[PDB]
Design brief:
The complex is a heterotetramer, with 2 copies of chain A and 2 copies of chain C. Chain A is largely without helices or strands. In chain A, about 0% of the residues lie in helices and about 0% in strands. The radius of gyration of chain A is 8 Å and the shape is elongated. Chain C is an all-alpha fold. The chains are: A little secondary structure, C mainly alpha. It is classed as translation.
Amino acid sequence: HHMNPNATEFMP
Amino acid sequence: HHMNPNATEFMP
Amino acid sequence: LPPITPQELESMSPQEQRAALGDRLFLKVYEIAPELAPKITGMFLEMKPKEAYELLNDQKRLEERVTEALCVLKAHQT
Amino acid sequence: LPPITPQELESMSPQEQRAALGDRLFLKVYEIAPELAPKITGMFLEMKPKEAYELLNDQKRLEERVTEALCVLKAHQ
């Protein structure tokens, strides 16, 4: 289970 | 692997 | 409830592991979310017994997992 | 963007998968939460590729996961 508020933003 | 909101409740 | 040693855990049956981990997880979850502790504990017990055991020895990670479980439950109502 | 087939996805490198899944997840998340779409898409991309791909073909569970991610971000305040 992954819902990490520190994840790196994804820019397209 | 994502947590399951339909999981069976645990009673101690 | 004293903590379970790793030696004890591997010497228990799958159902004994669940009861011992569930009992100790429930008490810690109850301090954070007393009303939803049975359901959140049930959600935790679907993880592998090694991962559930880690939560008993990492209060920071347990609290994060309780928040994650509440958010899964909140999203389920929507 | 056109959808990815499972046959294509299994034939891509990990970084090729992430870019293809990310671009498509971003578009859908942007319709729901345009401001936090970069952050939420990044949170989604920590899933395994098969799990992230299943969100692209299940709109109802995708919306649930966006709500979940917003809840996690709010709790982080």
